[PDB]
Structure formats: C-alpha cells, structure tokens
Curated annotation (Swiss-Prot), chain A:
One of its GO terms (molecular function) is structural constituent of ribosome. It comes from Schizosaccharomyces pombe (strain 972 / ATCC 24843). This is Large ribosomal subunit protein uL24. Keywords: Cytoplasm, Nucleus, Ribonucleoprotein, Ribosomal protein. Residues 1-23 are annotated as: Disordered. The gene is rpl26.
From Swiss-Prot, chain B:
Belongs to the universal ribosomal protein uL4 family. Component of the ribosome, a large ribonucleoprotein complex responsible for the synthesis of proteins in the cell. The small ribosomal subunit (SSU) binds messenger RNAs (mRNAs) and translates the encoded message by selecting cognate aminoacyl-transfer RNA (tRNA) molecules. The large subunit (LSU) contains the ribosomal catalytic site termed the peptidyl transferase center (PTC), which catalyzes the formation of peptide bonds, thereby polymerizing the amino acids delivered by tRNAs into a polypeptide chain. The gene is rpl402. Component of the large ribosomal subunit (LSU). Mature yeast ribosomes consist of a small (40S) and a large (60S) subunit. The 40S small subunit contains 1 molecule of ribosomal RNA (18S rRNA) and at least 33 different proteins. The large 60S subunit contains 3 rRNA molecules (25S, 5.8S and 5S rRNA) and at least 46 different proteins. uL4 is associated with the polypeptide exit tunnel. uL4 interacts with its chaperone ACL4 and the nuclear import receptor KAP104. The eukaryote-specific C-terminal extension harbors a nuclear import signal and delivers the ACL4-uL4/RPL4 complex to the pre-ribosome, triggering uL4 release from ACL4 and incorporation into the 60S ribosomal subunit. This is Large ribosomal subunit protein uL4A. One of its GO terms (cellular component) is preribosome. The keyword Nucleus applies. One of its GO terms (molecular function) is RNA binding. It is found in: Cytoplasm; Nucleus. The modification Phosphoserine is found at residue 35. Keywords: Cytoplasm, Nucleus, Phosphoprotein, Ribonucleoprotein, Ribosomal protein. There are 2 genes for uL4 in S.pombe. The lineage of its organism: Eukaryota, Fungi, Dikarya, Ascomycota, Taphrinomycotina. GO terms for biological process: cytoplasmic translation. The chain holds residues 53 to 312 of 363 of the full protein.
UniProtKB/Swiss-Prot annotation, chain C:
Belongs to the eukaryotic ribosomal protein eL13 family. Keywords: Cytoplasm, Phosphoprotein, Ribonucleoprotein, Ribosomal protein. The modification Phosphoserine is found at residues 176, 179. Component of the large ribosomal subunit (LSU). Mature yeast ribosomes consist of a small (40S) and a large (60S) subunit. The 40S small subunit contains 1 molecule of ribosomal RNA (18S rRNA) and at least 33 different proteins. The large 60S subunit contains 3 rRNA molecules (25S, 5.8S and 5S rRNA) and at least 46 different proteins. The keyword Ribosomal protein applies. This is Large ribosomal subunit protein eL13. The gene is rpl13. GO terms for molecular function: RNA binding; structural constituent of ribosome. PANTHER family: 60S RIBOSOMAL PROTEIN L13 (PTHR11722), LARGE RIBOSOMAL SUBUNIT PROTEIN EL13 (PTHR11722:SF0).
Length: 125, 260, 207
RNA sequence: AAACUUUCAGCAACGGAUCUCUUGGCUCUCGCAUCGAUGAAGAACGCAGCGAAAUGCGAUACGUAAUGUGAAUUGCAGAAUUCCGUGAAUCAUCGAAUCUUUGAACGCACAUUGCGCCUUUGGGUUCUACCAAAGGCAUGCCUGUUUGAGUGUCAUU
RNA sequence: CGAAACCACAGCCUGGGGAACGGGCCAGGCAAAAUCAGCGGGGAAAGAAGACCCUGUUGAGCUUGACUCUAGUUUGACAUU
RNA sequence: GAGAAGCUCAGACGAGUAGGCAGGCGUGGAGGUUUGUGACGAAGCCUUGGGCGUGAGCCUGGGUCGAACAGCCUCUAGUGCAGAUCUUGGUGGAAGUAGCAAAUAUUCAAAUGAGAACUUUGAAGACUGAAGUGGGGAAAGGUUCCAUGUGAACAGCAGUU
RNA sequence: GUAGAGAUUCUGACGUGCAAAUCGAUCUUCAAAUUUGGGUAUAGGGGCGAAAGACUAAUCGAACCAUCUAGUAGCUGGUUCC
RNA sequence: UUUCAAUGGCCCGUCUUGAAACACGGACCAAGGAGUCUAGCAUCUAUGCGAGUGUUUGGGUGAUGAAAACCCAUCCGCGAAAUGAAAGUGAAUGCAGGUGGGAACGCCCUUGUGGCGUGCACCAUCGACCGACCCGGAAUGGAAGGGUUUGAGU
RNA sequence: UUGACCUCAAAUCAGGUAGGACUACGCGCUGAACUUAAGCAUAUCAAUAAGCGCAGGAAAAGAAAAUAACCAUGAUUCCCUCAGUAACGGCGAGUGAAGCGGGAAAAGCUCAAAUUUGAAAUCUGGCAACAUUUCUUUUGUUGUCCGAGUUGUAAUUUCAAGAAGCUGCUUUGAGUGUAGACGAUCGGUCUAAGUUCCUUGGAACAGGACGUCAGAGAGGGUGAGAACCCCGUCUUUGGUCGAUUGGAUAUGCCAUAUAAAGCGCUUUCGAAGAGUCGAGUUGUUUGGGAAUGCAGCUCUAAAUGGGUGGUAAAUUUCAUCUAAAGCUAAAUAUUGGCGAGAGACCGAUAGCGAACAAGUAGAGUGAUCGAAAGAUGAAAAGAACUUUGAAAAGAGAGUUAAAUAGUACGUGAAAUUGCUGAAAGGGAAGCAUUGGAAAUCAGUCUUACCUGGGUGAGAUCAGUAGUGCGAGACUAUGCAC
C-alpha cells in the first residue's frame, strides 16, 4: 500500500503518464531483466534496453529466439530484434516488435555510459 | 454534483405556436446542426438534467455518542462469540480460544514472516488464505473509479503499543491493525454484520476494561460512561419456558395438530 | 395555500440564496491546517510558552458576573504593583492593556499575584550568553516549553460549605427587604423632589 | 395454379441501439502568488527534407547558448562527419540570448504595408538634393537642469 | 433521374342507436386477384394550439378633467451678494 | 422438528375512477458474504425450443460473441415510458409517383474513346440583330485565369467535357 | 411615345413556383417635385415619414443581439413496474 | 406455433355528466424523458439517554498514511414555570384532594352477564394553588377576606 | 541696465512614473425589472442583475469620540450562540440586526499641535572613490558641489501619556571554522521476491504443482485476472549549493562598547486636528421606530469642551470615550490562474459546448450564434499471385484464433428491405374462448432400497467373552470358524 502524498494511485493518471511519457522516460520504462549469469556478474536485477544488446525472448510465439536488438521503437514500446520477422503477402520480411519486459538480456553493449550507470546503480564490472 | 451551468450555456427561446413545432425553447441562428434544436429541457438532448445535483446535500449523518458506544460494545461482545464469527464467515474452526489473546511480544514483531508464522501457529492463517482466494475483479464501473479489486475481510489485530506490529501485519491481505483506544465500528462490524474475528494482545485485552468499564463503574478513558443494561436478564427463553416453575402452573399441553 | 397543521411558515429564502451557500467540506482540512500552523509557531518560538499569560477578569453582566474568565492584558497599575515596567512586560511576554482599570483591590491583588507567580516561574535568558544581568537566570540549561495555564490556570470563586446560623439571619426578612428596596429605588427621587419643593415653598411663604 | 398482399423463421441488407472499456468531463480537498511602456493579454504574417490543422518557434524562426540523461526520430528516408565519444533525440531541464508586423501602442495616419521630421555613418559628380543602414521623435504627471516672460515686489548705478 | 404534403388503424352502401350526420357498434343490402387514364361526392381531407365571442384578478398600441408620479415650465425664499 | 417471522383447524367474504396503505418484481453504484461464474467463453444480442410465477419478471436449450459478471443481507439513487403538435438519430407507405414543358432548333459525316444526343473538327440550317446572347469596366468574388491529366463526388439526363 | 422609372386590369400564368412576391399581356410616367451610383449624417420610446402606423437588413402599433431568466401563469398537454 | 371453424370483440391516452366519435395528440423504431435536493413545520414509527439531553464552534492522539474512527473543557440551544402590554408577581388545607366509569390484582361467594377491597391510563365533574382582571379597603407595601371571570398554568 | 525673490512657461533637457489585461474572492459608485403580495402603487425581488472606477495574495477593517450599567469589559477579523429575537413592514406579503458568553488568532503603534535657537543638527540630485549582489543585471556608504528647506526638514513627546525640572540607582554587534541540522536537494539509490513444470489458449498475465519476498498484496504496462517480467510501491543514508549567529560556551575571536537609556520622590505645566462637530431640511438607505448611516443645501461651534448612553424637548446629575490625521501581520474569503491528491459522480444523445486538429467547421453586416464526430486486429500480418472486366470491382487464392474482424472494420437490436421456406387471403387486419388439422417438445419409470431365489468365492456376524467403579453406547483384540 502506498503512503506518500506525492504518489498517485489513480488509474487515469497512471495511464496518462505511461502513454504520454517522453522518450527519456520511455527509455527507463522499456527495461528488461538480466540473465542469471549477468545478475551474478553485475549485481544488477535489470537495466533499460539498448541497441546492440543480445537478448532471448521468454514469452510469446517467438519464445527461445536469440538475437541482437536492431532498433528500439520507443513510440510503440517495441524492440526490433534481428531475424525476428514474419512474411508479408508478397514475400517481404516485416520485423515483429517485442516488449522489453518479455526479453532477457544475455550480453550488454558495454560503453562508458553503460559502465558508469552500472557503477552508479552499485554493481560490479 | 454536475456543473451549475450545464445545459444553460446556450441562447434558446421558444418559437411559440403556429410553427407546427413543440413549444420547447430552440436554438436560433443557422448554418449548423445545433440550429433549431431544442434546449433547456430535461427531455432534450444536450439539455439540463432534472433537479441538478447540489453540493450542499446532506452527505454526513450524526449519531449520538452513546449510541455509537452502544454499537461498539455490541460489536466487541459479538466478536467474543465464536458462533457469530463462523456466521460472519471467519475460518476459526481450529482457533484455540475465543477471544484470542496473544503475548505482548507480538507488539514488537518486525517482519511479515514473523506475523505470518504467528498466524499459522495460532491457526488464524485460514482467514488470510480465504481472503487471498476470494480476491477478484469488481463487477461494474467501480473499476473505472479506482475500486478495481474486492476481497473478503480477515482478522482484526488489536494492539496497545506499536513497536512494529502494525508494519509487520499491514501487508498481509485482509489483516487490519487498530489501537485498542480507537475501536472502529466499520472494522468491528464490517457491512453491518456482527462477529468480526479479532486477535487481541495481552495489553490491549487488559486495557479493555479501562476502555469500556462496566454497568456500575464508569470507564476511566470515557468520562461518565457506563455499559448498557439489557432489557432481559436471561436470554435463554427456551429454558425459562421449559423450566419447572412455569410448567407447574401452565394449563394442559393442548393439541399441536388437530384432526380434520 | 396553508391548510396543514403546525406553525405558519417563516422561511427567509426569497432572495438568490443558492449563490451564497457556505459548505463545510473543508472543516477537517482547516482543523489540520490550524494545528500545523500552531505546531510551526510552537517550534519557531520554542522554548517560549505558546500562549502568553493572561489576567483573570469578571464578565460585565449580571448573567456572568459570578464567573471568572481570561482578559486581554494586565493593567498599568497591576504592572507597577508587581514591579514590572510596561516596556519590559512586552519583552518578557506579559500583555499590557491600557484600557482596563482596577476599580477594586480584589481584582488588583488577583492579577498582581498572577504576575508574581509568572515572574517566579519565568526563566529569562541572558542577553549575552554566559553573562546573566539583572533579572536573568543563571540556570537556563533546564528550559523547556510549558503551558502557562498548567501552572497558572484561571480559577473560579469557591462557595462556602457551611457556617453557623446567626440571629441576624433569623430576624432578616428577605422578601420584605427586596420589596422595600425596589419601592425605595423608584420613589426616592420623587421623595427628594417633594422635600426640595416643600422647602422652597416654605421659604417663599416666609419671604 | 401463379402473380400480389399479410404473418413468422433462416441468411443477406439498412441503421447504429445494447454490452465492455476511457490519456475525457464534473465535484471535493490540499498547496502557491508570478502579467505589462525593460512593451502584457490578444491579433496578423511566416519558420521543418517531404507540413494545411494543432503544438512550438520568430528572418538566430518545430528554434541558438548553457545544464542533465545517454543511442536515437520514425511514415518515408536521410544522416555512420556515431558509440571507450563534453554526443542522437519534436528527450528532459533551463539562470544567457534571438524575439517579424501589430496590439495600452507611443512621429502623423491606416478600407493606404500611405505621409513625415532629427542625429550619425556609408553609395551613387553631389560641402545643401537622392538612396541605404543604425539610433530616435506620443501624452499626462513628479524631482531636478537650462533658457525665458510678467505696467507682481525690491538697489547701487 | 427522382421528391414532398399527409399518415391512430384503415377505407363499398342503407337504416338504427350514439357526444343528437359512423369506415368500425347492431340489423340488412352485399362481397373475387392485380392494374391504367381522368375526376372532384365523401374521407365533417390538408395547412395553423380560431384572427370572430367569452374567461383570465394575462398584456400591448392609443386617448383623457381615471389614480399615482415625472422631464420641462412659472413663482417665491435662502446663498452667491 | 417443520426458516414460532414457524406449524395446524375452521368460518365468512372478493366491482371499482379520483385517492390512501401494504407486500413484491426490475435497473445503476457502495459495504459484508458466497474454496460464487468465466477465454474449456463473462456481458450483450437472435431464437420458428423447454420450464416457473396470477403478475411485475426469472431460469434454461440452440446460435453469434469476445472480457468481464452474478446469488444472498444491508446502504444508496440522475432507477422502470406508448403518448407530452415531447428531444436527438435512423428509417417507411405515398412512389419509381408529382415531376425534370419560359427564353423559335437542330441535322449529317469524321476523329477520339470500352462507352457519343451533349467532347472536338468540317458542312448545313438558325438565333442574339450594335439600348446584343458583342467588346470593356465600377462594386462584389478570390484563382474561378492558362496548360497538362482524371472522370470517385457535383454539373437534379449523360459525359471522353 | 423608346430607354429608364413604376405597377391599373386580366382579380391571366404560377401558387409544395423560375421566384419566402416571379412571369406574360395590358397599363402609368418619361426633360423634371425626374431616375440613379459612390461618400456621408440621423439608432429603438429613438430615427425617418408629400402621413400608409408606413420604412428602419425577408423582422415594425416600438428592430436585432446577450443577460436578468429555468421570468409568472387560478390555463393546456404529459407524468414511466406488478 | 400456424391456420381453419362457431361465438364474442369499435382506437389507445386525455378533458369530460357523457368518446368509437365528424373532439384533441399519436406514420414507424431505437436512445433520452418529468414529485428531486435543501431551510423549516406537523403527525406517526424506531433508537439512545432521561430531569436532563445534544461529542464534531473548537481542541488532542497527528507523524506516521489519517476529509474516517476515537477522546476532551467552558459556554450555548431545547426542556425543567407560568402569567401580564408592562412594572412585577410567581403554583401542597388534605394520601398532591373529592365523585363516576375504569386495566390489573386480591378475598368471598358458589357457578350467574358473579358480591367486596383497592384502584394505573384516560374521560367527565366538584374543589385547592399561581399569574392577570374586577373588588371590599380591612408617602411607601399589598398581607389576611373575596368574585358572577380569565391563562397556551400547578 | 542688472541681480534677487514670486508666479507662470518651453525643451526629443537628466532621471522616473501612469495607462492596458486578468475579476473566483476584495473596496466603492451607479442601478433596474421580471417576481411575491393570489389584483396593485408603498413594500418585496434588492441596497441584487446589468454598467463604471480601483488592488492584493488576500482585500477590507483595526488599536474606541467602543460597550455596558455590571464584582464591570476592553484593537480589528472570522465561527457558534444571541436569533428568526429586539425591531421594521398597505403591522399586509414579508424583512430583520446588536451587547454579553464560548472558540480561532492575537501586536502594537505613527504624525500635527513644543523654541535646537549656544549654531537645519534634515533630505534629493550631479561628480568621484570604495563596497555589495539571486545578479557584471542588485543594493548601498563616504567625500565634494549644487539644489530642497526657516511660509519648517531633523530630535524628545501622541494623552496609555509627556516636557521642564529634582535626587540615587545599572552600562554592548558583527567577519571565520566545527558538531548537531534545514530549504533546495539529486553523483543517485544497499533499496525484495519465479518469469520453474503440466493442461487450455494465437498470446498465460487462466487453472493446478512446487516455491519466494513483504516496512513493498497502492496503481499502471506487458499478445486474457501478474506482489515475485517492467515501471513502480514501502523502508532508508548520503555526495552538493544556499539561508549559514537559524541556534550552542556557535566557540573562535574583530572592536561592538564611555554615554544614550534605566526606575525613584516632589512640584509647575501639560500645546491634542473647523465650513469640522452640531442644528434644520431634502433625497436615499437601515431592524434604527419625532432620521441608522451617506449625500446636496442653509446656519454654524466650544474648552472640563465635545461625542455616545437606541422616544422628541428643557433642566440637574452620572457613566464611558476623546472625532473631524495615518500605518499595521494572524485567525477570514477565493466558480480566476498554476501545481497536486481524491470521489458510493457520468461511461460518448451521459459527463464541460468540446474524450476526436472545438470555441473547430459552419451562420449572420454586426453584436453574437455554434455543432456533429471514440473503439479493426496482439501484431497490418491492410489480402502476394491467377483469371473475368474499360474501370470500379468480382471469383479463385492468401494473412489471422477469428475476414460471422477487410479500414463502408469491437459486438451489432429495432424501425425498414431483398431472397428462400411455410401458411392464409370474396370491400380491412389484428384479438379472446373452444376444438380439429399440420408441425414440434418432454415425460427413460422396470434408477435405488428390499422379499424369494439358481452359480460363485470370501481377512466371517450377532449372541458370548477379555480389554476409568454401577449402567446405555462404540474403536481395537482372542473364542465363536
């Protein structure tokens, strides 16, 4: 149960904030859990998703599909992963968007900002 | 309440008779769907509702303090009756004793794990399981108004001193923790139905006499308050009727059923 | 039309009363706001008492002259008798009322004792720390915010439990005294006028 | 007997009721005090690679400076001048700036992008005319400054 | 290519009764699909909460020696003096 | 025992506008309760099947459907429609009916085109007959002006215009 | 008597019209108290009126717009389950 | 369920003495659509307390998480006294009275729709007391004595 | 002739200032009528609507020319009560305060009237210097000069007093740093827990099994009801800036800090607001009644004087206050603006007119008037390709869990319409009762208990009997086989 007077339990307000959040907020919103090995290594439960990230799908029809995040569609809260597509009528390939919470990261895209974020969150590198 | 100007933000006047139209006021002008349409009527689309709701309606109801104390005392006495708890729906079949009084070390609990373990040891966890199983989605439009989930009521833990018991028990579904000095009728008889399962601490149970007093001695925590007197001394009217003193003086038994 | 039992209607609702309706839905909010404000005031003025010392006065009507209530401020005569200057009274938290006056030694002494009790229980912090001047307290270490009325409350006049019956009480006729006093109070002016007119007429006849 | 009409049912139509939702409305409560001649509110005209509306912005124009986060925007692209990098974003924040014509609107007017005046600097032969740029020219009132008026009152010349 | 007015349901007559001239009620004359062009007897046809009359303790325009006032105008007093 | 608010026996009576009272059916929301129903299908809707109640109404079989809903004890209200020349919206008979008849008038051949009575070209016959159906302007309109394409909507017939 | 300006009669056509005042024939006047464009002034108990209570934006014996106003109605209509 | 056959059956609502009316509204269907809330008053009912009753004008637990529940003091509203315009005065002779009916109870009859003793509630009635009015009338006071009266009193 | 003073001008002189917008609340002016009185004129609506002027975060009011009549109270404001009362009112309809009492909050003061006269001690501006900053943006100090000012700027006084005096009493703000903190805080969080298995399902977030966390089972999202998938929720310290005497021995330590106040007895004085008070009349207003307040006009004051003490006048007392000058937070209001938390409210003809590019489209010359319109699907996967057709489109196909979801898209009623099937029909139809005809629907009883009884195996039952005292009951055990 929430107690803070600055915390709103209104469903209307919560939905408005979620569906109207800007790109910076949506980046934090689109977060994926780390694998078990990554959890031991970095002492971090989950991180926001990013491009060039190796993930495997846990839910949905494309379960057990390993791939690297090719793009992050924050406008639609979707992740476009490599080789995760479906055939259109004419034979072209249309990528299938996957929610961030439905995938688990198996290999981070390490950089200065990513390492600084991990250390800031209190995790081993 | 609805807006005070709802249905009035328009300039509509009746056109009278002779136009082969109802005498309801109509919107003037032209060039839009609204032109010529009726207004200001409770029977009219986009009009003013009949008897618009006002904010100065009597929302709050006053009850005499003596009547409130009577209801609270009745709720406490009802909670002390094991049959009423079962009737109200509390799973108290395996409870060791009613009223259930626990040691004062419960007031110093620090973890929900300890609270759950104590409930299991005193066999009061069945109510929590019942509440968890009964949790469902509300039927109707209350979901749209921040009332999505409904569930049953579990045990009511009454304490005297707060040393962590409130925080250790608050996350358990159905469990409500209250101080003994501020017993609430909404919790003691939820829904107007008597027989709420109450778990007392030793200090709270000991202070119950100070809180309520007796019929002849006033409570020290309520100024000049005495417990109500009942209009009947012995409520076992079946025993009184079948007692020897009455059966010795009554007439013949009489036929319960008579032949046609 | 009026055709039912009961008193005739007297409703004063012939104006636009609906636009001046005062609701009380902010009553718990106002109560909380006032409590928070006085808590903030107590914190900011600590360790000074929240409520200043007030005098004991008699209400001005026969309906209430048998009671004692709290006044606005102590009179100049009371402050002088208690040995407190009017300029220093405000600094040490003693209200000053220049309008009230002491017509009776009872009220004068009643308020003077209150000022003396307040002075005795008062701790005056030195203007410069560690340098107690005239009237300052050398033991300001144990200072805390206390209720003024908790040590100096307003007290009502006590009644006498019993006393022996006197012969003057036996011979006193209360109803006859009340009737005679009432008759005297209204006819005394007429009697005095009659005596003056009789004296003037007698002197004029003598002339 | 057909055709026709009527009633019902099954499918197909017309229509958008019912049901379920809702980034909306209404009401209550709590907190705060910040527009403008240093040019407000409002109006007009323009600004994006592809843009009429809404939002934002003003010829530095979906904006510049500065700060924060850290790989996107997305409909199509374009951009690898990108990622061990003080850097993408219609991101967030925001203490420096830009801020068109107007509008209390202020050179005079305005159903006119009309008619003027002053200073300085440059271009066309132009110490004076013309053109261009920059800075200015409203009224009432206040305190001071300067220049004045009065057969209003006063002195030695 | 393509409406509108109108539409309680509908529509063959006589007599009776009836809110005193019925398409429906009662008694009779009768009674056979689906349609075209005219027609003006009937539907007391349609339009328009009768404009005539009356009621309303409902108005408005106008008139006057109706009641109550008023702009203006005349006279006096006081001040300016 | 017979939800004592229960069980049992007997007698009499039954029109009803205006109106009064009582007991019930139905709708939205709230508290309590029902190891309540439900994606193995909730609500809603259709039904030429079934059952119950005097009735308001309720349960159910078969279809469609896709995400919530209900029984009981109380609380509560913007709670029940055939009318109001009621409101909004949709849709009928009239009806393929009234009608698309002022301004003298069109015809032939070719081209284009899927499609020609309305387009274009040529020929013929005509009209406005200089106070014009001619050539320009003021007010008003604002791109209707021109070229190239189109024939979804408009041009109450049609269209290649 | 033409243009222009009007509208006597047919009480013609039409009268869910081409048209919320039009069409045809006929008729009045046609060098002045003529007709008319643009600019301007007069604003509602007011304007203007060769005077009809006429005109004052299809509205005139007191225009239009918003508000008081959900004006009042002893009157008409309606007023929802057993 | 449909249809047939016999018999019966006028179009609903409304104003009205009277409607099928040649009286008005109604072409059809869906959704919406009209005795509500508030300040009072009167009767009745329920609840709590009771010569008292009313916590929420306000203050505290308060910070937690608290528009709630709970607690707390002085006033004040109504009632406990009425009467007169008012100045004023201000309710026990008695078992807080007598009479008649009267619930319930008790005692006797002797089975009668019974006799006796008290007697709640309520009504009727004769009195007593308080205030007002009218008296006698025994400067200021109206105490015993009264009345054919009067009050929304005891 | 000139200068000075006085008055009045001009300047695109130096530096400033006002307008306008917002009006929920606030301070005023002006000001109706509808309506009620069952008519209507006074009255009521209403000291309201409309119009006009003027502010702030609050405004206004405010420290008595106040109540009371008391054992007296004591600035203003607001709440309860006083009280639907006193009172006003064709005394009709109706209207209608105030003292006291309880509570919230409390805070006091400043000028003019004084001779400093042994020294205008006062203030603005220009110039220069030195400081300061929310800040190169802000705010001052010093020196000098010029102006203002003696037709009065400063100091002690404001009636509660105070001055002139008389005699003895005591002597005080600003710079640094630490520990504890306090606003913004944000280097940001140590901040907890399943996305294991089986079934259904397109998708598990559904059901079941095994678990986990909880100071976190509020809420939201994710392909269906998710505490443990994600954002979050709960709990909880700290890097930073600033207010940094806001406090402490704010220590540490600079000069703040030598003469201004302090009470005391005694006297002498004690300046106190003018077309103002007050009186008359008129108009308006009020509950204000021979005038409650305001305003116009006429008259016009006084010094123990003047105001008030709710019935006009005269006279004699008494009580209270000290007008005609000014400031002041708090408790109070807030349908405007900004931010936030909620709801027994409405669920697209509802709720604001506007859930959607709504004060938008559109109408009127104009003031103004002013709508309609939400939902495919989890994901466009938005139907490749073949064929017919000029084309629009159709038929095959294809995607999807679903095309009974194809953008004319959630489900998809009625009115109305087409096809098919059944039935009926001579100038209505519809309905009710009874039955025929045709069509259609349910009644599975002979389940189950039990008598007799053919084949069949089988740890064998009551009666006994042993195992908390009498006795009824029963679980278990050996005989009864």
């Amino acid at each position: 149960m929430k107690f803070s007077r600055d915390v709103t339990s209104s469903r209307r307000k919560q939905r408005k904030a979620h569906f109207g959040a800007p790109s910076s907020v949506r980046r934090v919103l689109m977060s994926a859990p780390l694998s078990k090995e990554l959890r031991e290594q970095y002492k971090i439960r989950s991180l926001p998703v990013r491009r060039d990230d190796q993930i495997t799908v846990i839910r949905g029809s494309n379960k057990g599909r390993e791939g690297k995040i090719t793009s992050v569609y924050r406008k639609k809260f979707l992740l476009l992963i490599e080789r995760v597509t479906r055939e259109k009528a004419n034979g072209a390939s249309a990528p299938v968007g996957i929610d961030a919470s439905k995938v688990v990261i198996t290999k981070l895209h390490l950089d200065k900002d990513r390492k600084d974020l991990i250390v800031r969150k209190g995790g081993k590198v | 309440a609805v807006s005070e100007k709802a249905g009035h933000q328009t300039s509509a006047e009746s056109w009278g008779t002779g136009r082969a139209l109802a005498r309801i006021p109509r919107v003037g002008g032209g060039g839009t769907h609204r032109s010529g349409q009726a207004a200001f009527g409770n029977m009219c689309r986009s009009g003013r509702m009949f008897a618009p709701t006002k904010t100065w309606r009597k929302w709050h109801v006053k009850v005499n303090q003596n009547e409130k104390r009577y209801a609270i005392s009745s709720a406490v006495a009802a909670s002390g009756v094991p049959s009423l708890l079962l009737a109200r729906g509390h799973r108290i079949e395996e409870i060791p004793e009613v009223p259930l009084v626990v040691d004062d070390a419960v007031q110093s609990f620090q973890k929900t794990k300890e609270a759950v373990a104590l409930l299991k040891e005193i066999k009061a966890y069945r109510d929590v399981v019942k509440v968890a199983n009964s949790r469902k989605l509300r039927a109707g439009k209350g979901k749209l108004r921040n009332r999505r989930h409904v569930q049953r009521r579990g045990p009511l833990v009454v304490f005297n001193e707060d040393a962590g018991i409130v925080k250790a028990f608050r996350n358990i579904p159905g469990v409500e923790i209250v101080n003994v000095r501020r017993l609430n009728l909404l919790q003691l008889a939820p829904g107007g139905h008597l027989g709420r399962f109450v778990i007392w601490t030793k200090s709270a149970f000991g202070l119950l006499d100070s809180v309520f007093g007796s019929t002849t001695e006033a409570a020290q925590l309520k100024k000049n308050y005495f417990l109500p007197e009942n209009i009947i001394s012995n409520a076992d009217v079946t025993r009184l009727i079948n007692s020897d003193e009455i059966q010795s003086i009554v007439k013949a038994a009489g036929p319960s059923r008579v032949k046609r | 039309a009026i055709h039912v039992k009961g008193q005739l209607p007297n409703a004063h609702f012939h104006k636009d009363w609906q636009r001046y309706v005062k609701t009380w839905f902010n009553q718990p909010g106002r109560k909380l706001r006032r409590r928070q404000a006085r808590q903030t005031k107590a914190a900011k003025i600590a360790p000074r008492p929240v409520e200043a010392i007030r005098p004991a006065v008699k209400p001005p009507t026969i309906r209430y002259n048998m009671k004692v209530r709290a006044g606005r401020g102590f009179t100049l005569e009371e402050l002088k008798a208690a040995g407190v200057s009017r300029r220093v009274a405000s600094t040490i938290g003693i209200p000053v009322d220049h309008r009230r006056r002491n017509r009776s030694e009872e009220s004068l002494q009643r308020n003077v004792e209150r000022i003396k009790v307040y002075l005795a229980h008062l701790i005056v912090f030195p203007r410069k720390a560690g340098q107690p001047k005239k009237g300052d307290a050398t033991d300001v270490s144990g200072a805390e915010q206390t209720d003024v009325a908790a040590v100096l409350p307003i007290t009502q006049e006590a009644v006498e439990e019993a006393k022996p019956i006197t012969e003057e009480a036996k011979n006193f006729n209360a109803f006859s005294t009340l009737s005679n006093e009432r008759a005297y109070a209204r006819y005394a002016g007429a009697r005095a006028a009659f005596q003056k007119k009789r004296a003037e007429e007698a002197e004029a006849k003598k002339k």
